[PDB]
Amino acid sequence: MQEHYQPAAIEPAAQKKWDDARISNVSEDASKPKYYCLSMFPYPSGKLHMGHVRNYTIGDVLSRFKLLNGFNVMQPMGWDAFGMPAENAAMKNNVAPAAWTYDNIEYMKTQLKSLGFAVDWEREVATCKPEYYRWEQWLFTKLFEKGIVYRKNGTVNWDPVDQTVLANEQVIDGRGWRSGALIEKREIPMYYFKITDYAEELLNDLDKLEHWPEQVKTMQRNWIGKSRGMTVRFAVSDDSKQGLEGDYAKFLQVYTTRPDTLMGATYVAVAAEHPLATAAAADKPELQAFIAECKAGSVAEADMATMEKKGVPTGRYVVNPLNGDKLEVWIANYVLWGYGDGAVMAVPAHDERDFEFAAKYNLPKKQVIAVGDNAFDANRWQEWYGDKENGVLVNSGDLDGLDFQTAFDAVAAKLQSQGAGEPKTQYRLRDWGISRQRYWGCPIPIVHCEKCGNVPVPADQLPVVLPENVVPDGMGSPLAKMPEFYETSCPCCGGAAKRETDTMDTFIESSWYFFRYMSPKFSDGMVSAESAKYWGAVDQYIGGIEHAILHLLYARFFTKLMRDEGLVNVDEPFERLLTQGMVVCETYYRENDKDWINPADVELTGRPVSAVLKADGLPVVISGTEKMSKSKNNGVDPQELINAYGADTARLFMMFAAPPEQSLEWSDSGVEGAHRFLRRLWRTVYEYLKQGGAVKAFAGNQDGLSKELKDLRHKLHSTTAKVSDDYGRRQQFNTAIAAVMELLNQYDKTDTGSEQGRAVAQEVLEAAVRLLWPIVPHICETLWSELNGAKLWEAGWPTVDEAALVKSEVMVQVNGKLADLEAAALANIIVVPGRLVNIVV
C-alpha cells in the first residue's frame, strides 16, 4: 500500500476491476430481487455540468447501496438527443446536428465513465437513432387509428423574419425574442394527444404514489385542474338581443364552481371572441380595439395570473335565473375562449379576482356568504370571503342558512327544474400538441394523399428515417425544403403523396425511455414482454424539480397508454421520486466600454478581501450568487474538478455540501475539505496496516472487552444503523457522511493497540469503507482490498450488531434492612463495591 493517496492511480484501476467483473451489466435474473434506479438522462449538449454530476452521483449512491444489499440493480444511462440545441449549434458551426450530437455523446460518455458511475452501458440508448424512435412512430400510428392521436387546426405564433414558429415564452411584447418583429397568429393543422381522455385516471392515480413528494402531487393536481361545478344559463334581456343568432340570442351560458354564490353575482364577463362581444362591439370602436388587443395577446400559463385583468362594459344585459336581477355583460381579458363556454359570472364578494376587478371599476359587491360573526368589509378583502367549508348562505332568500354542499344541490335543483342549468365537471388540462416545425426531431409517420387523406405509415415501413445529412440554414424548417424526403407514394393507393414534414415534441422520447432500457435491442416491439414483466416499474427516480409537471405527467400518460396497448403491466412508471436542488455559484465580471468571467479563471485575495484574474492579475469585481448558467458565465466545469482532485473528491463534495433537495453552493474551500477527508481516510487505514497488518475483524460476544472498546463498537453499530437509515429512508447523504466522520473521530481517541484493540479497529475500518463505498467507491474499493481479501460487493452492506447497542443491579437498604451507586441510590452511607449500598441514617 502506497503511503499517499493518489486518485489518478487508483480510480482507473477500480473502474477496470468493476468493468471486468461486469457488476453493472445486469440481466433478467429472477434469482436476485430486482431494483431499478433511474436518473433523468441528459441532453448531449457537449460536456457534463455540475447539475449532471450531482444528479448521477445521487443516483449512483442509491444504486451502490442497493447493490451492497444484494439487489439486482439496473442503473441505465442514455441520451435525450433530439431538440433545438443541436439545430442552433448546427447553424452557428455549419455542422450536421447528428454529427454534432454523436460527438457530444462520445465525449460525455467518457466523462460519466471517469466518474465511476455503476452504469449498465450495454443498455445505452440514443433517442435520435432510428432503432429508438421507430417505436414511438409505431405507437403514434396505433393511437392515430384509435383516435387518441388526431389532426386538427391550431393557432401558433409565426415569426415572419426568422421564418419559424415561436412559443408564448419566446414572445416579448408581441415580438419575436431574437428577431424583434411582430409575430402573426396563424391557424395551421397540427397533431394532438387526447390526454384529456385520461385526465381522471391521471388525477386519481396520484393517490397511489405514497413515496412521491406532496408538492409534486399537488402541482400535478393543479395542472389537471379538475373542478366540480355548475353550468348556468342567463337569459339575454329583451333589449340586448340585437345581432345575436341561435342560442346566443336566447341565453348566455357560463360555468361556475361556486353556484352557492349565484345570488351574489353582480355582473358577467365574456371572452373577446364571444358572440355577445362581437354583436356589442359592432358599432363601438373602443370595444373593437379591446377585442383586438385581447386577440393579439400571447400570455404563458405561468404568467396568466400575474397579468393585469382589464375589461370593458358592453351595454348588453342578461338575467340571473335565481333572483331576476339584470346584470351587465363585460368583455374581459382573463376569460379564455376554449375554456368552458368562454363566459363566467363574477361574485366580487367571495372571489378575490372578482373583488379586485370590481374594485377597479367600482362594480357592486354583494355578500351572500358568512363565516362566523366575522364582519364583512366591502373595501378590504379578507381570506374568509372565499371560504367554502365553514361558511353559510345569507342574503340568498330561501337558500339562507345552508352550507356549501347543500346549497350546491339546492341551486342545482332550482336550475334543472326550470331548465336554467345543470351540474358539470370540467378540467383545466388541454390536449397535448406534439407537432413541431423543426428538423432535428422524430418524423411524424403520416403521408398526405389527396385521395386517401392523412394516412399512417404501415408498421412494415417504419421507421420513417430522418435524413442526417442536413445542415439547417435559417429560412424555415429544412424538411419542407427537401422534396427528396417528402415526395413519396401513398401506402394505401400507390399514388403521388407527401410525407408530413413536422417532427414530434421532444417530450415524447423521454415519456417512455425508461421502458426501452428494459430491452433496448428488442426489434419486435417497444419493450419485450419478458423484460417488462421482470423489471416492472422504476423503483427510484431522480431528477430536477423543473420536470415535476410536464415530463412526469407525460411519462405517466404514456405508461397508461402502453399498458392499455398490452405492452406493460404497471399503472405508474415511478415508485419513489427524489428531486434534486440547483447548483449555484458566485458571479464575476469586469466592465466594458459587462462581460462575465468564469470562476475557474479567477483567483481571490488572513481574511479574503477581493478577487483578481488568474491570467492577468489586475482586480475583478465580485457579484451575487445564483444558479450556474451561460448567462453570467458562473458555471464551474466539472472536468477541471476531476483533473485537479479526482472523481471521488467531486462525488464527496456534492453529497456532503447539501442535502439533495437543498440548493448546493459551490465552494473552493468545501472542495478542498472533501479532498482532505479522503487523504485522512487513506492515512487512517495506512497507519493501521503499517503497525501489524490486517487481522480478523472482531465478531460476536463482546463480554470481556474493555469499556473503551465496547464504547467504540457501540459507536460503530450506531453509525451503521444511522447511515443505513440515511441512505434507504431519509435519502440525506450529508448526515451519513458526518456520522462516519464521528466514528473516525472516536476511533482516533481510542487506544486500539492491544490484540482485542486491533480486532475492533479492523471491524471499524471494514465497516467505514463499506459505509462510504456508495459515495466514494474508488478509494473504498482500494482500501477494502488492503484490509480484506473478499470481494467488497460480496461482503455486503454492514450489519448492525444489536448486542453492541446494549449497555451494562444492586440492592439498597435503609438502616440495615431492605460515589457511582450512591448518586442513584439516594434517588430511590457506605457502599460495598458493586453489590450493596446502605443508607446510614
Ligand X SMILES: CC(C)C[C@H](N)C(=O)NS(=O)(=O)OC[C@H]1OC[C@@H](CCCn2cc(-c3ccccc3)nn2)[C@H](O)[C@@H]1O
Residues of the shown chain interacting with Zn ion in the complex, contacts defined by CB under 5 A: 449, 451-452, 490, 492-493
The number of angstroms, rounded, from the C-alpha of 694 to the middle of its chain's C-alpha atoms is 47
- Closest separation in Å from C-beta 637 to ligand X: 9
- Amino acid identity at 153: N
Please count the other Cβ atoms lying within 10 Å of the Cβ belonging to residue 141. Answer: 21
- Closest separation in Å from C-beta 495 to Zn ion: 5
- Closest separation in Å from C-beta 187 to ligand X: 30
**Interaction partner, residue 129 (Zn ion, ligand X, none; CB < 5-8 Å by kind):** none
For residues 316 and 322, is the Cβ–Cβ distance under 8 A? no
Please count the other Cβ atoms lying within 10 Å of the Cβ belonging to residue 754. Answer: 12
Q: Which residue lies nearer to Zn ion by CB, 144 or 517?
A: 144
Residue 355 host element (H or E): helix 352-361
CA distance 252 to 341: 9
Q: Which residue lies nearer to ligand X by CB, 267 or 515?
A: 515
**Interaction partner, residue 40 (Zn ion, ligand X, none; CB < 5-8 Å by kind):** ligand X
Q: Tell me what percent of the chain is helix, strand and coil, each rounded to the nearest 5.
A: 40, 20, 40
CA distance 641 to 643: 5
Q: Which residue lies nearer to Zn ion by CB, 449 or 787?
A: 449
- Amino acid identity at 660: P
Q: Which residue lies nearer to ligand X by CB, 510 or 720?
A: 510
Q: Which residue lies nearer to ligand X by CB, 113 or 498?
A: 113
CB neighbour list of residue 793: distance below 8 Å, 6 or more residues apart: 21, 23, 67, 68
Cis bond upstream, residue 659 (ω within 30): no
- Closest separation in Å from C-beta 66 to Zn ion: 54
- Closest separation in Å from C-beta 673 to ligand X: 21
Q: Which residue lies nearer to Zn ion by CB, 282 or 459?
A: 459
- Closest separation in Å from C-beta 584 to ligand X: 8
Q: Which residue lies nearer to ligand X by CB, 255 or 666?
A: 666
Say how many CA atoms lie within 13 Å of 108 toward its Cβ: 26
**Interaction partner, residue 452 (Zn ion, ligand X, none; CB < 5-8 Å by kind):** Zn ion
Going by DSSP bridges, is the β-strand pair 664-665/619-627 parallel, antiparallel, or unpaired?
unpaired
Residue in the shown chain whose Cβ atom is closest to ligand X: 544
**Interaction partner, residue 490 (ligand X, Zn ion, none; CB < 5-8 Å by kind):** Zn ion
Q: Which residue lies nearer to ligand X by CB, 255 or 512?
A: 512
For residues 439 and 87, is the Cβ–Cβ distance under 8 A? yes
Concatenated DSSP letters for 362-420?
A: T------EE-TTPPP-SSS--GGGG-SSS-EE-SSGGGTT--HHHHHHHHHHHHHHTTS
- Closest separation in Å from C-beta 309 to ligand X: 34
Judged on CB neighbours under 10 Å (0-12, 13-18, 19+), 562 is buried
**Interaction partner, residue 23 (Zn ion, ligand X, none; CB < 5-8 Å by kind):** none
Give the torsion through C-alpha atoms of 522, 527, 531, 534, to 10 deg: 180
Q: H helices of 489-645, where?
A: 513-516, 529-535, 550-564, 638-645
**Interaction partner, residue 668 (Zn ion, ligand X, none; CB < 5-8 Å by kind):** none
Positive/negative CA dihedral, 554, 556, 559, 565: negative
Going by DSSP bridges, is the β-strand pair 226-236/311-319 parallel, antiparallel, or unpaired?
antiparallel
- Closest separation in Å from C-beta 497 to Zn ion: 6
Q: Which residue lies nearer to Zn ion by CB, 455 or 765?
A: 455
SS3 per-residue string spanning 670-693: HHHHHHHHHHHHHHHHHHHHHCCC
Q: Which residue lies nearer to ligand X by CB, 88 or 629?
A: 629
Q: Please give the grid coordinates belonging to residue 618.
A: 489586475
Q: Which residue lies nearer to ligand X by CB, 404 or 440?
A: 440
Please count the other Cβ atoms lying within 10 Å of the Cβ belonging to residue 627. Answer: 15
- Closest separation in Å from C-beta 500 to Zn ion: 14
CA distance 287 to 312: 7
Q: Which residue lies nearer to Zn ion by CB, 186 or 451?
A: 451
CA distance 542 to 576: 9
Q: Long-range contacts of range 395-404, CB-CB < 8 Å, 24 or more positions apart?
A: 395/263, 395/264, 395/366, 395/367, 395/368, 396/263, 396/264, 396/368, 397/263, 397/323, 399/260, 399/263, 402/260, 404/260
Residues that bind ligand X (CB under 6 A): 40-43, 49-52, 55, 80, 510, 543-544, 546-547, 551, 582-583, 627-629, 635
- Closest separation in Å from C-beta 126 to ligand X: 12
**Interaction partner, residue 795 (ligand X, Zn ion, none; CB < 5-8 Å by kind):** none
Q: Which residue lies nearer to ligand X by CB, 50 or 86?
A: 50
- Amino acid identity at 359: A
- Closest separation in Å from C-beta 546 to ligand X: 6
- Closest separation in Å from C-beta 458 to Zn ion: 13
- Closest separation in Å from C-beta 772 to ligand X: 24
**Interaction partner, residue 635 (ligand X, Zn ion, none; CB < 5-8 Å by kind):** ligand X
Concatenated DSSP letters for 774-795?
A: TTSHHHHHHHHHHH-SS-HHHH
**Interaction partner, residue 449 (Zn ion, ligand X, none; CB < 5-8 Å by kind):** Zn ion
- Closest separation in Å from C-beta 140 to Zn ion: 19
* Angle at which helices 97-114 and 7-21 cross, to 10°: 100
- Closest separation in Å from C-beta 112 to ligand X: 11
Report the SS3 class of residue 330.
Answer: strand
- Closest separation in Å from C-beta 523 to ligand X: 25
Q: Which residue lies nearer to Zn ion by CB, 452 or 839?
A: 452
Question: What is the CA angle 177-182-183, rounded to 5?
Answer: 80
**Interaction partner, residue 492 (ligand X, Zn ion, none; CB < 5-8 Å by kind):** Zn ion
- Closest separation in Å from C-beta 51 to ligand X: 3
**Interaction partner, residue 550 (ligand X, Zn ion, none; CB < 5-8 Å by kind):** none
**Interaction partner, residue 504 (Zn ion, ligand X, none; CB < 5-8 Å by kind):** none
Q: Which residue lies nearer to ligand X by CB, 51 or 520?
A: 51
Q: Which residue lies nearer to Zn ion by CB, 451 or 696?
A: 451
**Interaction partner, residue 551 (Zn ion, ligand X, none; CB < 5-8 Å by kind):** ligand X
Q: Please give the grid coordinates belonging to residue 324.
A: 331576476
Q: Please give the grid coordinates belonging to residue 106.
A: 462520445
CB neighbour list of residue 187: distance below 8 Å, 6 or more residues apart: 153, 154, 155
Q: Which residue lies nearer to ligand X by CB, 45 or 237?
A: 45
